[PDB]
Design a protein around this ligand. Structure first.
Ligand SMILES: NS(=O)(=O)c1c(F)c(F)c(S(=O)(=O)CCO)c(N[C@H](c2ccccc2)[C@@H](O)c2ccccc2)c1F
Ligand SMILES: NS(=O)(=O)c1c(F)c(F)c(S(=O)(=O)CCO)c(N[C@H](c2ccccc2)[C@@H](O)c2ccccc2)c1F
Ligand SMILES: [Zn+2]
Ligand SMILES: [Zn+2]
Lengths: 261, 260
């Protein structure tokens, strides 16, 4: 029953979830004073991201975001263990303020943000298990700006009217998940942080791509108006809007960049 | 009890200070989407700010910031009620990231921020009593950026070495506090918000001046490096740095401006 607004919003999460008050918290503002080029940040390789269109993947409204489950044959290579996909999901603002990314860059929000969550499959049986373990999770973040219509993102957004309420599930045909990543994936920011939602475990290796992708105002409006945090039958409905955490103090941490300029 | 760093950090203030998780929380990002000109916002008059240089004013390190006590004959004229001064203090970052203002403008931090705290002395007997009441407090905020040396800020900063550790105090001779305000104080942002420190009571009328002041790079480094959060005999000393709150969500609300 944590939320992003009101008595149970983010400044209260630590009452029930201690790690949300702990160190290494995400998201953060990416700005020059805390950036440092690291030449060892070589390009990631995205394996098994081309999901078959004849197969289907479960989309669920979990009351906090909408998530698409991903198969464990989908992996990122380049890290010092292989990390296998578990789910992707989004964070966004609202129709009157389409500025709901979690990470900011030099103090500016982007319209939305996509997270593709992976767990260390070398060392762990599943994501739940990896989630409280050192080195356990790797999340890829794509910053989303308002711009051109994006047919790849529409492969997810076209199914939102079927997961409007908490607990609802729908199937999305497979598509190539790499189509959701931006240009020049070799350029990214990398840092040690946390889940941006309760329980806020400080166990995530973040990669935020330097370049945003674009989706249209109509696509953002659909995302911002389609979904509810509450069940279909709840007499106290709550729109699922502004589901991003404020940026966190950078307790002496640097962010490492694969790009020098 | 509470700190700006670590386990007792701002995300955990709401356990012991429930208003830290409530409504109307400050500080906020001031950005053009939420700005609205309001002609009712006339210039404030700063009365009694020219402090007798024959009086001394106590400077304290309280483990959270450095604060100067101010006399209640010092007040703002221009609001509904008279608001009388109680103290001023500052918030800053650290030398590796010297951007520690509380408010932000179009998503940008300034180097530091000075707050001159006042309380409604028409309605209440002192600031302690006003701090949790309707209309209780008014704070003036001055954004600070690095630039020219500022002699007026140096009337405070030259005493910092005598308040290095928590609980230390020094005496500061009266000077004209208006010298700490920026150019064109008629230009400001105004909104209802809260204390930015526990107990975070939503009882502050904010006035954030549009224009920043400048202090030199040496002045700013002095403020970032002179002080500790800890007592002198603490075997584990903590530097006093990054003593600002993160910006709060501020949705379906306006900040009013005295300028268009
Ligand atoms: N933004 S974030 O990337 O930091 C994030 C979220 F924003 C987010 F909304 C979720 S959520 O599952 O979609 C709804 C809130 O739990 C998860 N889901 C968690 C998760 C999924 C897969 C693998 C690890 C973690 C979460 O539900 C969870 C937490 C702890 C243990 C198991 C699962 C998550 F990681
Ligand atoms: N940053 S702020 O402008 O919003 C603010 C105020 F608005 C404010 F009114 C005060 S206060 O005058 O001391 C409250 C009356 O006791 C403090 N002082 C803090 C405080 C003490 C007791 C009760 C409430 C708040 C004190 O903790 C402090 C002093 C200096 C710098 C940071 C914190 C303060 F930080
Ligand atoms: Zn996320
Ligand atoms: Zn203050």
């Amino acid at each position: 029953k944590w939320t992003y607004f009101g008595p149970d919003g983010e400044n209260s999460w630590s009452k029930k979830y201690p790690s949300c008050g702990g160190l290494l918290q995400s998201p953060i503002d990416l700005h020059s004073d805390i950036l440092q080029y690291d030449a060892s940040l070589t390009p990631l390789e995205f394996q098994g991201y081309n999901l078959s269109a004849n197969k289907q993947f479960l989309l669920t409204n979990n009351g906090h975001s909408v998530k698409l489950n991903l198969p464990s044959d989908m992996h990122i290579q380049g890290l010092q263990s292989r990390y296998s996909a578990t789910q992707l999901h989004l964070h966004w603002g609202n129709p009157n303020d389409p500025h709901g990314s979690e990470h900011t860059v030099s103090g500016q929000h982007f319209a939305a943000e996509l997270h593709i969550v992976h767990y260390n499959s070398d060392l762990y049986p599943d994501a739940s298990t990896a989630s409280n373990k050192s080195e356990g999770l790797a999340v890829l973040a794509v910053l989303i700006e308002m711009g051109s219509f994006n047919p790849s993102y529409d492969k997810i957004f076209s199914h939102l009217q079927h997961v409007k309420y908490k607990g609802q599930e729908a199937f999305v045909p497979g598509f190539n998940i790499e189509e959701l990543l931006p240009e020049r994936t070799a350029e990214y920011y990398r840092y040690r942080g946390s889940l941006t939602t309760p329980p806020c475990n400080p166990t995530v290796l973040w990669t935020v791509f330097r370049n945003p992708v674009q989706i249209s105002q109509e696509q953002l409006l659909a995302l911002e108006t389609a979904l509810y945090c509450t069940h279909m039958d709840d007499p106290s409905p709550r729109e699922m809007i502004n589901n991003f955490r404020q940026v966190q103090k950078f307790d002496e941490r640097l962010v490492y960049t694969s790009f020098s300029q």
